[PDB]
Amino acid sequence: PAMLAALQSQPDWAAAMDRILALTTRNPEAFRQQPQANRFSAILEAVVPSRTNPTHEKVLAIVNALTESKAIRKDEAGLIYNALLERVARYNSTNVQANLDRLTTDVREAVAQRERFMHDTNLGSQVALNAFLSTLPANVPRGQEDYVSFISALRLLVAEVPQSEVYQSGPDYFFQTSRQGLQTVNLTQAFKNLQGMWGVRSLLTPNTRLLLLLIAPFTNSSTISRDSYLGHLITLYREAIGQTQVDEQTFQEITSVSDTGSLEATL
């Protein structure tokens, strides 16, 4: 967000007194040959460099930052830029003209948090979930305490699938997405229909089934035993996921050999 300001403005002096002096490597005999007008319009630069006025540049180094995180929309950085320039062209001083400098050489460096924001989704995945888990009932359900293993598999899923896995709080009911596409929106305040079977050995509306199928991959010997339903189903969903991988590769193979066809004797 700065070199995009460098690569939007500011067309050096070492590179100029490295060429006039003929200290380059590839073609030293470069500056000598130019017309004796250029060679007298580049020698009086690396002999008495001309000052500059950097405000615009680093101000453009701030706009290109805002509009890349999300404030000032892409189409408004022609009013924001003028407004910022005129503000910093009023109150300017070594005061502000520096306070910028720090802002521009910190905003491009203090981007690690932003990177973190999208590397553990600690923006709407764990802060939301670790909020929703605090809206759950007490952590002592009656039947079993396979509860905690499931509720931890949920956190692991949300933390190890950065894709989007956003956890909205679309009003009273917090709902889990499986991707920004969102074609597996399962309601996470509607598994207070699993605070039923948390411990037993057709009452699951697929919404609950959707959550089970969504996390299952991330369950191993955790939700465990023959803890009824919740146990097996998870195991059966994992088995079905493996079989689905098998059938996926099989169908690609059988359609690369060559119409419903494979879809029948696969499904």
Partner: protein, 49 residues
């Protein structure tokens, strides 16, 4: 009866140039010679007739 040829040379809409370079030619702008009296804050004074 006898002839004493006269002879002219109309030219209209054209401004005689005298371009100022060496090979009185045109190899650019900031033309050769000009380029010399560039930097040198030198000063001169024509006087054509």
């Amino acid at each position: 009866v006898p002839s004493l040829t006269q002879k002219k040379f109309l030219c209209d809409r054209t401004m005689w140039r005298i371009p100022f370079s060496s090979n009185f030619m045109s190899m650019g702008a900031l033309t050769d010679l000009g380029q010399n009296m560039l930097y040198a804050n030198s000063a001169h004074a024509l006087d054509m007739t």
